[PDB]
Nucleic acid binder design. Sequence first.
RNA 1: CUAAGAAAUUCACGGCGGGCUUGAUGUCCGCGUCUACCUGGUUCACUGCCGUGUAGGC
Length: 189
Amino acid sequence: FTMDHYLDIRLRPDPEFPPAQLMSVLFGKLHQALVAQGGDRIGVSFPDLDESRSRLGERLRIHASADDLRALLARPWLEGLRDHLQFGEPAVVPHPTPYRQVSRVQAKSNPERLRRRLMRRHDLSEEEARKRIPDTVARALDLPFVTLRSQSTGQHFRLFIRHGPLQVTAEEGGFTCYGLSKGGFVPWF
RNA sequence: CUAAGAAAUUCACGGCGGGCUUGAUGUCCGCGUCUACCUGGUUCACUGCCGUGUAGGC
């Protein structure tokens, strides 16, 4: 009733398995696919496949109702792989209630950028640009890693995804997707 | 209840100096070292509508 279709993809094993890079190419091809389609009406999740909360799953599930799904990256609208997945076909969802959330976050682990932005913003001096308020004392960080090289005009990002409150508490009908490529309230298993 | 039981050695010095080891020599001949490999599980990156304001953006 929220977005009632799912694709239980299973990335097969392969003697080349950089998971950051496999999910990088997959999420990047998905980015290309949905910016070619166009629309803030799509869902993406990652079911309970992260055993620890360090790794990330070897699976995926896309949540678009009928038309965006069948027209977007699917059996039509080429993936360009069709061999490394051998995936299936979607169908209607059951009735769970884990409160349905996923999230994107990014942190700061390179104060060179911040000091350079200070130097650029109002022509800061080197001594204060060195000790006004960097975070040289401690380097923040985030656990779940995916690489996702730049869509264009850039270089290797390192994107972080935190599963939101997945509590068996309630449910609500909210927006379709936040960010750009990531649904909002999404059914979870 | 110890062949027990005890015990101040203490003082100084000129080893001196001289010298031909000499000549000579043929190491001399060989040699199959092979064979196959994923550096990949990682580059926390230039910005900026930013909030320098530790959450905030592709």
